[PDB]
Amino acid sequence: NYTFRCLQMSSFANRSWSRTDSVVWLGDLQTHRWSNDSATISFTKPWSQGKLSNQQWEKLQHMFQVYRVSFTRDIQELVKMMSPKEDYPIEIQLSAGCEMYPGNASESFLHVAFQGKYVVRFWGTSWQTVPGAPSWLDLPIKVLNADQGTSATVQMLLNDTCPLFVRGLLEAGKSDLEKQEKPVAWLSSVPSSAHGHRQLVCHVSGFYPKPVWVMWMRGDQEQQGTHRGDFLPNADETWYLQATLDVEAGEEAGLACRVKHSSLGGQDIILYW
Amino acid sequence: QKTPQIQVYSRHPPENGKPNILNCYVTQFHPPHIEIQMLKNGKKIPKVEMSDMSFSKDWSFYILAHTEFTPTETDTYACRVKHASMAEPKTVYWDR
Ligand SMILES: CCCCCCCC(=O)N[C@@H](CO[C@H]1O[C@H](CO)[C@H](O)[C@H](O)[C@H]1O)[C@H](O)[C@H](O)CCCCCCCCCCCCc1ccccc1
Ligand SMILES: *[C@@H]1O[C@H](CO)[C@@H](O[C@@H]2O[C@H](CO)[C@@H](O)[C@H](O)[C@H]2NC(C)=O)[C@H](O)[C@H]1NC(C)=O
Ligand SMILES: CCCCCCCCCCCCCCCC(=O)O
Ligand SMILES: *[C@@H]1O[C@H](CO)[C@@H](O)[C@H](O)[C@H]1NC(C)=O
Ligand SMILES: *[C@@H]1O[C@H](CO)[C@@H](O)[C@H](O)[C@H]1NC(C)=O
């Protein structure tokens, strides 16, 4: 079960200054980047072309090159329509892709945010504003929906190209997608926000894939004070997580941190404080 | 407009005199224009590597900065962020 997402970030500061940059993810691994400064889309894996021929990839890339220029022009024009109703700076984000369900299934999506808020999606055969989107967007969306060529291309991309491309990525990227990297753990302590206490920290770094279990223990007893942080990325396509425990002075003795992970083969790491 | 959150952490267990990587992960900000500096003893570290900016399902942006370092007993490290949402730069120190 993998989410494939193409993430477009477009910034318009004035009529003269704008940039569009994109990144593409297959699950939590980056497969592409396309900087504003680059004419072509960059591969960030050896397998980023999936199973498409150079012909098919080039046709896709050319379509996206035309899109990037056209989108920029359209936005700066489709500003003036409902402007100075609205005006600069303008931030647009687009998230498009597909989720590859069990067996044969997949569902595609194309969502757009304006000034950090979801306003528009493509759905079935047309663009639509979401309930509560600013009413001024209705006219620009009507203008976009009159362009049947764009509609047909987006329909193709969502219905056909996305799942097609992703099947090929999954096959081509198998050894990376299924990689197992082992966590290494360590213990430290930092100041607590509560008086009379210290915060014990169990650090877990370098593991892949994400799913992991980390708990402070006193023997077989799980310490329910265990506060798991967020998954934080390392720069080498592995993960970091810490689990903290606020403990009373002289209650530290007997505590351990226990880590379970798919890569360890049932052989948990246990560190004692 | 959304304020950046900043987390600072090492790639490997810190051992004095052993090469390591220090990470500064900056999240939850909007708009995406931002300046990120990593500091050693209050001075800017030159060769800091930046990931490509990206964003979450909730549309908030994130980016990872990192740098090679060899910790010592007395070197202090931090990550300092400038963003339009904050009048002042925000600094978080590595906890070591
Ligand atoms: C991920 C979208 C992929 C679409 C790429 C394919 C279509 C395309 O690039 N269309 C271009 C040019 O299309 C022409 O040429 C075409 C072929 O070459 C056709 O022949 C077609 O018939 C012509 O018309 C077209 O100009 C599109 O309008 C490009 C932009 C389409 C993206 C729509 C993004 C929705 C943005 C909503 C933003 C809401 C916020 C907002 C709106 C307005 C102002 C400020 C903020
Ligand atoms: C892309 O897929 C969508 C499926 O959501 C198609 O849109 C549907 O088309 C049928 C007719 O075949 C309509 O009765 C439905 O109402 C549409 N669904 C929605 C949710 O609006 C679309 O036609 C497909 N396009 C292509 C080119 O394959
Ligand atoms: C609507 C996009 C979904 C279909 C994409 C399938 C082909 C993969 C393309 C990978 C390159 C990413 C291009 C990013 C362009 C952009 O969004 O600005
Ligand atoms: C446009 O925006 C850029 C980047 O923010 C800025 O350097 C420039 O001063 C602006 N130009 C005009 C004419 O407003
Ligand atoms: C982004 O790319 C466009 C098209 O190549 C270019 O004209 C523009 O100057 C770039 N924007 C910035 C801020 O460099």
Residue numbers in the entry:
A (entry chain A): 7 to 279
B (entry chain B): 2 to 97
Sentences from the paper on this structure:
Invariant natural killer T-cells (iNKT-cells) are a small set of glycolipid reactive T-cells that bridge innate and adaptive immunity. Whereas conventional T-cells are activated by peptide antigens presented by MHC proteins, iNKT-cells typically recognize glycolipid antigens presented by MHC class 1 like CD1d molecules on antigen presenting cells. Structural data illustrated that the lipid chains of α-GalCer are bound in two hydrophobic pockets deeply buried in CD1d5, 6. The larger A’-pocket binds the fatty acid part while the linear F’-pocket accommodates the phytosphingosine chain.
To further evaluate whether the low antigenicity of 5d is resulting from the amide functionality in the phytosphingosine chain, we synthesized glycolipid 23, which is the amide-deleted counterpart of α-galactosphingamides 5d and 5e. To gain insights into the poor antigenic potency of the glycolipids but high affinity TCR binding, we determined the crystal structure of the CD1d/5d-complex as well as that of the complex of CD1d with compound 23, which resembles 5d but lacks the amide group. As expected, 23 gives rise to well-defined electron density and is rigidly presented using the conserved H-bond network involving CD1d-residues Asp80 and the 3’- and 4’-OH of phytosphingosine, as well as CD1d Thr156 and the glycosidic oxygen, and most importantly, CD1d-residue Asp153 and the 2”-, and 3”-OH of the galactose. Especially the 2”-OH interaction with CD1d Asp153 is increased compared to 23 (3.0 vs. 2.6 Å), while the 3’-OH of phytosphingosine is also less intimately contacted by CD1d Asp80 (3.1 vs. 2.5 Å). When looking down into the binding groove of CD1d (TCR view), we noticed lack of the F’-roof closure by 5d, while 23 induced the F’-roof formation. We next compared the precise presentation of both ligand headgroups by CD1d. As suggested by the changes in hydrogen bond distances, the galactose of 5d is slightly elevated compared to 23, correlating with the increased distance in H-bonding interactions with CD1d. Since the only difference between both glycolipids is the presence (5d) or absence of the amide group, this indicates that the amide is indeed responsible for the slight elevation of the galactose but more importantly for the failure in closure of the F’ roof in the binary complex, the latter of which is likely the main reason for the low antigenicity of the α-galactosylsphingamides.
